[PDB]
């Protein structure tokens, strides 16, 4: 994290982790679209010609005030696709909370597994334990006809019972509720 007693502001880093085309940038775009122009910064998206995230998406939220503190939440999304691992692992610099965006398509349940595993590897290499970090999981793409059932998707991705939220990113369903969950967890009085 980062406290600023003299400035009276709190800064936290949240990272959306997930395989390719699983909806991280979509989460952030929807968030930016429905946030008052007063409490949000510009949405930066280091993307390629194809619209896939090339380094990261970054979105600040000058959100409300804690016990008088300013509170600023820094949303990040990684490149996700496999061959950008080099860059992906960099986004977890001073990560304070994680959101795992799982693609609920059946074809990409394997890639979901691989991406969660890459997540654990990269956090450990960064000096973080996935079970120790505040982290939430999202089951994106709940609008598809053959989207894997929520239960059978938890069995494969959520053995430890961390908060799960079903979402349809483009529409925004589940998006802000996911962000709220991650934020409430990140706010550590411990
Ligand atoms: N069917 C369905 N498609 C979705 C949903 N959310 C996002 N998509 C689509 O999937 C594609 C991937 O979205 P995108 O936002 O680029 O994912 P990403 O995680 O940022 O992809 P990357 O950065 O790892 S490469 C987009 O074309 C988007 O429209 C959803 O909830 N349901
Ligand atoms: Mg993206």
């Amino acid at each position: 994290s980062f406290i600023n007693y003299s400035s009276r502001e709190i800064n936290c880093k949240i990272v959306y982790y997930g395989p390719g085309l699983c909806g991280k940038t979509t989460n952030l775009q929807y968030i930016y679209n429905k946030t008052a122009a007063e409490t949000k910064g510009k949405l930066i998206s280091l993307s390629t010609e194809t619209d896939r995230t090339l380094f990261f998406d970054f979105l600040p939220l000058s959100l409300g005030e804690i016990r008088g503190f300013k509170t600023r939440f820094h949303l990040y999304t990684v490149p996700g696709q496999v061959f950008y691992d080099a860059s992906r692992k960099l986004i977890l610099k001073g990560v304070d909370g994680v959101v795992f965006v799982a693609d609920s398509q059946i074809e990409r349940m394997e890639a979901n597994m691989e991406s969660l595993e890459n997540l654990r590897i990269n956090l450990a290499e960064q000096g973080y334990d996935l079970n120790k970090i505040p982290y939430v999981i999202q089951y994106n793409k709940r609008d598809l006809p053959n989207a894997v059932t929520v239960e059978e998707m938890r069995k494969a991705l959520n053995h430890r019972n961390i908060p799960e939220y079903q979402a349809v990113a483009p529409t925004g369903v589940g998006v802000f509720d996911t962000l709220k969950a991650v934020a409430k967890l990140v706010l550590t009085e411990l």
Side-chain angles (χ1 to χ4, degrees), residues 1-64 67-188 190:
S1 314
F2 168 84
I3 318 291
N4 207 329
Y5 282 128
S6 194
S7 301
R8 288 186 181 182
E9 57 191 35
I10 298 177
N11 302 79
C12 303
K13 182 170 202 164
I14 297 164
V15 182
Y16 284 76
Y17 214 101
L21 306 73
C22 69
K24 302 156 270 36
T25 306
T26 303
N27 262 55
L28 231 58
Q29 292 173 343
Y30 183 82
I31 280 184
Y32 179 88
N33 278 329
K34 305 324 186 67
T35 280
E38 302 173 348
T39 43
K40 68 191 180 190
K42 295 183 176 181
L43 169 56
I44 300 193
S45 71
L46 272 34
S47 82
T48 75
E49 183 178 5
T50 348
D51 273 358
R52 299 144 125 88
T53 312
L54 179 61
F55 192 165
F56 67 93
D57 295 309
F58 167 65
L59 179 63
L61 287 176
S62 24
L63 214 298
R67 296 179 63 183
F69 282 92
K70 292 173 182 177
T71 283
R72 249 244 242 80
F73 272 98
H74 299 245
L75 287 43
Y76 284 79
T77 86
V78 305
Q81 223 157 16
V82 45
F83 46 107
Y84 295 117
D85 190 341
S87 296
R88 170 153 16 86
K89 39 191 299 182
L90 302 192
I91 265 52
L92 303 149
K93 333 159 191 172
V95 56
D96 299 331
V98 174
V99 172
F100 193 88
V101 184
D103 194 306
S104 283
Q105 266 171 328
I106 221 310
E107 294 80 54
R108 323 221 68 254
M109 194 61 49
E110 33 184 328
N112 264 333
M113 310 260 201
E114 293 178 358
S115 204
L116 174 45
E117 195 203 26
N118 185 260
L119 172 68
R120 180 136 31 200
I121 278 58
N122 278 313
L123 288 137
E125 184 196 76
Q126 210 84 24
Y128 300 92
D129 173 11
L130 201 174
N131 313 46
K132 92 179 186 67
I133 199 70
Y135 129 78
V136 181
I137 186 180
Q138 184 200 311
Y139 301 152
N140 202 9
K141 308 202 172 195
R142 302 310 302 176
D143 57 333
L144 301 169
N146 293 326
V148 171
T149 81
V150 156
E151 278 71 24
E152 199 218 342
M153 243 181 43
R154 175 202 296 107
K155 291 176 40 180
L157 307 164
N158 193 341
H159 315 89
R160 246 296 212 84
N161 181 29
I162 54 276
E164 58 182 24
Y165 298 84
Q166 315 167 28
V168 168
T171 287
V173 346
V175 180
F176 270 89
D177 291 55
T178 293
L179 186 59
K180 296 177 148 222
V182 184
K184 289 175 183 184
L185 272 57
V186 164
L187 291 185
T188 178
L190 289 59

